[PDB]
Write a protein that binds this ligand. Structure first.
Ligand SMILES: [Cu+2]
Length: 129
């Protein structure tokens, strides 16, 4: 069972993956986010956020309004299954979540909630396999 993934968000507003697989034998799954490049948090800060496909737009919109000092997420947002903090270059963060939080049939999306980043396609799918 492969129960973690290392993902990078760079100074050019991209993740180095578009698709995450979660082994369904995993009890927990861990995302390790890092930020190659030179740009600080306030310029090109990234996070990793998990929601259902349907909820992503809302999470992003409300997170935009919540703003930078809230790490671009509505605090305690019920739609956020898991999330890292916002990180700048040189910084890192991990998040671990229960795999039981994912449903059969459902469609899940990961993304950066930082202003404009998801629109520029800092997103992809997350799928139970
Ligand atoms: Cu970002």
């Amino acid at each position: 069972a492969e129960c973690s993934v290392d993902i990078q968000g760079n100074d050019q507003m991209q993740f180095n993956t578009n698709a995450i697989t979660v082994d369904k034998s995993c009890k927990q799954f861990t995302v390790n986010l890092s930020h190659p490049g030179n740009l600080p948090k306030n310029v090109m800060g990234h996070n990793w956020v998990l929601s259902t496909a349907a909820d992503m737009q809302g999470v992003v919109t409300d997170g935009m309004a919540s703003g930078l000092d809230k790490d671009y997420l509505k605090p305690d947002d019920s739609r956020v299954i898991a999330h890292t903090k916002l990180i700048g270059s040189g910084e890192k963060d991990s998040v671990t979540f229960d795999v039981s939080k994912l449903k059969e049939g459902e469609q899940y999306m990961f993304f950066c909630a930082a202003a404009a980043h998801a629109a520029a396609a800092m997103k992809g799918t997350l799928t139970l396999k």
